[PDB]
Amino acid sequence: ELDDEDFRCVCNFSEPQPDWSEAFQCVSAVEVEIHAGGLNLEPFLKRVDADADPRQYADTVKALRVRRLTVGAAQVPAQLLVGALRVLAYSRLKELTLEDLKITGTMPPLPLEATGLALSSLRLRNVSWATGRSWLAELQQWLKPGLKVLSIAQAHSPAFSCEQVRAFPALTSLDLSDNPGLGERGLMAALCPHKFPAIQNLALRNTGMETPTGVCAALAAAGVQPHSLDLSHNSLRATVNPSAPRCMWSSALNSLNLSFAGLEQVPKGLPAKLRVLDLSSNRLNRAPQPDELPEVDNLTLDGNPFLVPG
């Protein structure tokens, strides 16, 4: 129905003919989600097809403290989803989240200038599109340049056309977690070069990769200098497998996470400088030799087979 305790919403639906009208209960709330449970929004056409600024559907959102939006079950044609994006451009919204959708149709070109919105931390999970090879680039046309955080999880044909993608001036973080099929090569063809110029925190979790050395080379090969870096869910190994004449580790690279993995012994290509190094829940063997350890700063360790006896 619509349960909220003075700080959220849900609008958990499922019925064969959703009476969305109750939605207005959780208006002007900061956090808000709109479930739908395997819905087909293809007969739902109205209203948004005379969408922008009238004398009725425009100033109602001149200031509507809804900063965090989630829309996680429906199936939206692109002809309208963009509509929802456009109206909100007026409003005060920052984080947008699509989850388990399926965009159909084909996305329309934009008339005037940047009618888009100042999205802050746009996230994506299991969302499928139309012109699959190019969905971000097309979607960018309705986002304001100011973007801080990108999380992209799940897909079908992971790739995107990193060639008409524009700017990303300040994409601070970047999360490509939960894509068990990205890989070190898929990675280089993920973060387009001379694009994503400024990347601080950087999550690359369960993307099904192996050794760090490849990642060291791949980021240098690409064109990024990360700060934090998360790998907390891969099948990691330990070798000198080609190549590493001197793995050009990104100097100012900092906080590294290697928790929860098939980590056998500590690998190679570990820069001697960090800030924080997490590593719990591993399958390790005693020694902290310089042959198997860079100078830490502070290592949180709560799992591991060191805290084993019992």
What characteristic shape results from the CA principal axes? elongated
Share of helix, binned: 10-25%
Biggest beta sheet attributes = 6 strands, parallel
Termini separation comes to 48 Å
Q: In CATH terms, what is the architecture?
A: Alpha-Beta Horseshoe
**CATH superfamily heading:** Ribonuclease Inhibitor
PDB class: immune system
Keywords: alpha beta bent solenoid, LRR, lipopolysaccharide, serum, CD14, leucine-rich repeat, pattern recognition, endotoxin, sepsis, immune system
Assembly: monomeric
Entry title: The crystal structure of soluble human CD14 reveals a bent solenoid with a hydrophobic amino-terminal pocket.
Highlighted features:
4 helices; membrane; Leucine-rich repeat, LRR (right-handed beta-alpha superhelix); 10 strands; little secondary structure; lipopolysaccharide immune receptor activity; 310 residues; secreted; six-stranded parallel sheet; 11% helix; molecular carrier activity; repeat
